Amino acid sequence: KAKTRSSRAGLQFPVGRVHRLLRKGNYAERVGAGAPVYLAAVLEYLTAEILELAGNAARDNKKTRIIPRHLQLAVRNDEELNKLLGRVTIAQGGVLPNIQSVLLPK
Amino acid sequence: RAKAKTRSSRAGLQFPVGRVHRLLRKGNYAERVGAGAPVYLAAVLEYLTAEILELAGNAARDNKKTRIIPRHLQLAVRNDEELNKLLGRVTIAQGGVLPNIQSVLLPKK
Amino acid sequence: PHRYRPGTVALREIRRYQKSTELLIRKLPFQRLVREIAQDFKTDLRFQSSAVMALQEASEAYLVALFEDTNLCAIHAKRVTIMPKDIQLARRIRGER
Amino acid sequence: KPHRYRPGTVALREIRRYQKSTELLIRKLPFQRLVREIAQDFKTDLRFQSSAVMALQEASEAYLVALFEDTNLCAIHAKRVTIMPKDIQLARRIRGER
Amino acid sequence: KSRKESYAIYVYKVLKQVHPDTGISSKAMSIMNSFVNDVFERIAGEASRLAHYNKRSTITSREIQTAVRLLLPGELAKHAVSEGTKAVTKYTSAK
Amino acid sequence: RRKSRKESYAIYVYKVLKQVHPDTGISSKAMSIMNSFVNDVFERIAGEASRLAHYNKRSTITSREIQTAVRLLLPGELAKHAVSEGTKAVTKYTSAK
Amino acid sequence: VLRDNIQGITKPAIRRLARRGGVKRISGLIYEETRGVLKVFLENVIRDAVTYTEHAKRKTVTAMDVVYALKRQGRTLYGFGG
Amino acid sequence: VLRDNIQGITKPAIRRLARRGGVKRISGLIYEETRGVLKVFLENVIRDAVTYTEHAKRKTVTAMDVVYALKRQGRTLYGFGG
DNA sequence: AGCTCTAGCACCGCTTAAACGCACGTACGCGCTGTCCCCCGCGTTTTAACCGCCAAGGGGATTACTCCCTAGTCTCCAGGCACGTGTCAGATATATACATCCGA
DNA sequence: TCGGATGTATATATCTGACACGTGCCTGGAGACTAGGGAGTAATCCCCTTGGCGGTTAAAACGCGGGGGACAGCGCGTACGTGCGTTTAAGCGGTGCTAGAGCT
């Protein structure tokens, strides 16, 4: 019986695919076996964080399907995923609802 | 054995194609490096070096100096509109800044 | 008859367009502009339908972001009307000019 | 009565002097202590190459000088001669630093 | 090749683990896949620089951990390092 | 002990200086900047040449990748001259042994 | 040959973009300045995109070509491929 | 041991930097704003520099660590190697 | 080099709602003014930055040795990915609450 | 003040095409074994960072006068917003094709 490296680490992201991409990407002459495991975990964790905040935004909008609007709202409302994705444009994401108080009526 | 002649001298370049070739390989930029790749790259680097040194030498003469110093390099890189675009994100050590004052700050009669 | 005063609907339009995700520029006119520019680099180029949309998404996002920077510098001059000098200052402080 | 230059005259002379020369404007020791103070908060007993402190100073002075140019522009844009904190805050906000 | 590899299945499995009641549009999924690929390239890209700067020839957990400490903001980094170290610990301990 | 050899573009920058300005010299500090500049531009073109090969999933970096990388990274007139210089160097080199 | 299509980007479209950007009031000159700015922006992105197309020896600009151009210019776009 | 050295960067030092930046008149409030901005700038660069030092398991921060930190931060410094 | 057959390009026809030109008001640009304050310019005071020389030790660089870790290859098999499918989430349509703005 | 206008938000129902589910299968991961050198260890060295003393002398700090500019307040006008009638062409549906991306 063969047990996939993803299940050994308790991860969903494919360690094998991450290992193959690390090797095929020519990022270095060699790739330690711990590197794809560690990287897959970081990517899987960051994926959950985005999806978690996006899911909350969806529930707040009484929606149960994540759409680009929820991703943008989550990314821009999160004080640190915005720092990670400050240079990133999200298709159909739009912008955060924001009006400067100087523009509002007295 | 034929007399060894450097690829740079064959290409009529001062920059070492061999060194550029070794770095293109040692840096693992790709699995393989075509023999023409380091020649083309060395020529571009040699040209860009001449471009900055020419303007820097002019700035040195304009400053009545014979040795190029970082000030001359900054004045050259910043006075040229294209070099300032290529090196806009680049800071030059001890280069200072261009001697420009906003006209609105100058006194008026 | 009833009429909304100047800026009343503008505040409503802001909410409408901030609440909406769709592209604000007409798709076909933007595609024509892309072609007009692209043809200068190479004749009879072809564009994937998704490539034109990618250009529009980026162009609208860039302009919207620029208008925010424009608005912020307009507010800094204690003005509410954005002027070309606001765009010029924003583009200058952003480092793209 | 003693000779006195008009307000801003010496400022213009100072601008020329500091723009013409390439001397570093921050004292090395106060900046070096500042670097080690900030560094001591990230990892204890770190050591700094003399050139490493200088590299940080050149970047820091270039960053602040560039920021002051952008700050002067937004101050001038507000039709003001005196730069205010809101000018720096706007420059940083437009620069995407906030 | 004709077959295209995407994180769709894994993003969906993570979504199921996060919010089983919640779905995700194909457009949002495309964004997520592009985000995962971009973050992968950033970490692997920085990991290559770290190895080269030390003239090292292999990417290890230390390079990934350091790249994550450099690219991720502080709390994302601390939590991602905890997740990465936990996953490597379980993997190595499970043997 | 003896210091292990550190490579530098110093002598090549100097030979180019002697060409553009035989009477002009260059301080060690300015030379260090020029060396940093050469290395930075090298890494930028090489980094883009890698992406180009990778985007087409090619295994070899050739003159085509370098020429395209130069056109992308360098500004308009610098690119035109650099492409001309790179082409002239490569074409004449091909005529050699 | 298509020409003078920049004026085809309607005045309300520029207004809508400004409204989304939070602009309450728009000067009559913003429309020409925005078209010029957009013209420069699209020129830079299309120049690089076409350059990738030409290097690939292709005649059709793929959406990935635009993403690479945007990626090179530090404005990476998510949603059109990885 | 070390404390408050951000206040040791003198008011004239900030003035000189502003004068080189072409600023003709400087409000007294700029000094504290500048120290705060300078502090966060140095913190970001030093954090990355120390991270390179730590990954190399070294105890002294080299000029290369600073140059790589700056390069990663998006601002390249010429004249210190690399 | 060769084939495939994708989908990009082109056009017609109809729809309609966005775009436009124009009417006309008053919101807001900003010239002008007042004024007071706070920043400048200078002298005085002073302090710690700087220079320079010496300690010393540690940690960085180097050599030598090792070994255990990864790349390559092979076998294998079931995970993952196009095809198939359908059912139910939100678009569309309708009713209708409820806050905000305007005209008096 | 304030009530009326009135757009936006919310609640309900029908629908539907999109994604959630199922399947076939095959290829790339997993298991196995190897070589061998990169990384890790240990010993060494020395240099360069930290640390101290001395002093001086330039630079910083401190006070002050005062002036000019920050900007509150004002005037005021025209530019820009809103509304309307007009019409424009974008968008959609459909049909044609074939360059040229994709694969071998």
Short mmCIF file of C-alpha atoms in Angstrom, two decimals, chain D residues 30-44 46-48 52-57 59-60, chain E residues 69-70, chain H residues 2 6 9 38-55 60-62 64-73 75:
data_model
loop_
_atom_site.label_atom_id
_atom_site.label_comp_id
_atom_site.label_asym_id
_atom_site.label_seq_id
_atom_site.Cartn_x
_atom_site.Cartn_y
_atom_site.Cartn_z
CA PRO D 30 23.46 58.77 16.17
CA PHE D 31 22.35 56.84 13.09
CA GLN D 32 24.55 53.85 13.98
CA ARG D 33 23.06 53.74 17.48
CA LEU D 34 19.60 54.07 15.94
CA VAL D 35 20.37 51.11 13.66
CA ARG D 36 21.66 48.97 16.53
CA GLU D 37 18.68 50.03 18.67
CA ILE D 38 16.21 48.93 15.97
CA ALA D 39 18.35 45.84 15.29
CA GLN D 40 18.53 44.95 19.00
CA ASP D 41 14.73 44.70 18.93
CA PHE D 42 14.86 42.00 16.21
CA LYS D 43 17.83 39.94 17.45
CA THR D 44 20.08 40.43 20.46
CA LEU D 46 23.94 41.48 16.50
CA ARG D 47 27.05 42.97 14.95
CA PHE D 48 27.14 45.38 12.03
CA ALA D 52 26.46 47.86 6.50
CA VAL D 53 25.68 50.90 8.65
CA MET D 54 26.79 53.21 5.83
CA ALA D 55 24.62 51.32 3.32
CA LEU D 56 21.60 51.78 5.59
CA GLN D 57 22.39 55.49 5.95
CA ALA D 59 19.37 54.38 1.63
CA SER D 60 17.74 56.21 4.55
CA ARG E 69 9.40 35.26 6.82
CA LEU E 70 10.51 37.77 4.17
CA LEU H 2 20.26 51.77 23.77
CA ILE H 6 15.63 58.33 17.14
CA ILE H 9 18.79 62.39 14.94
CA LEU H 38 12.32 57.07 9.10
CA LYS H 39 11.80 54.61 11.97
CA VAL H 40 9.38 52.46 9.98
CA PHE H 41 11.67 52.63 6.94
CA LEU H 42 14.68 51.40 8.92
CA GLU H 43 12.56 48.78 10.70
CA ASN H 44 11.44 47.24 7.40
CA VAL H 45 14.95 47.24 5.91
CA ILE H 46 16.62 45.97 9.10
CA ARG H 47 14.01 43.23 9.57
CA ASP H 48 14.79 41.89 6.10
CA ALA H 49 18.54 42.39 6.56
CA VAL H 50 18.51 40.52 9.88
CA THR H 51 16.45 37.81 8.19
CA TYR H 52 19.21 37.29 5.62
CA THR H 53 21.78 37.34 8.42
CA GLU H 54 19.74 34.82 10.43
CA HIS H 55 19.23 32.48 7.46
CA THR H 60 27.19 40.21 11.89
CA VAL H 61 25.02 42.04 9.38
CA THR H 62 27.02 42.47 6.18
CA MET H 64 25.27 42.34 1.16
CA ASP H 65 22.48 41.59 3.64
CA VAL H 66 21.52 45.27 3.55
CA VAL H 67 21.73 45.46 -0.26
CA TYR H 68 19.60 42.33 -0.64
CA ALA H 69 17.08 43.65 1.89
CA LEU H 70 16.84 46.93 -0.04
CA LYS H 71 16.69 45.11 -3.38
CA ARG H 72 13.87 42.92 -2.06
CA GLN H 73 12.17 46.00 -0.59
CA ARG H 75 14.82 50.00 -3.98
#
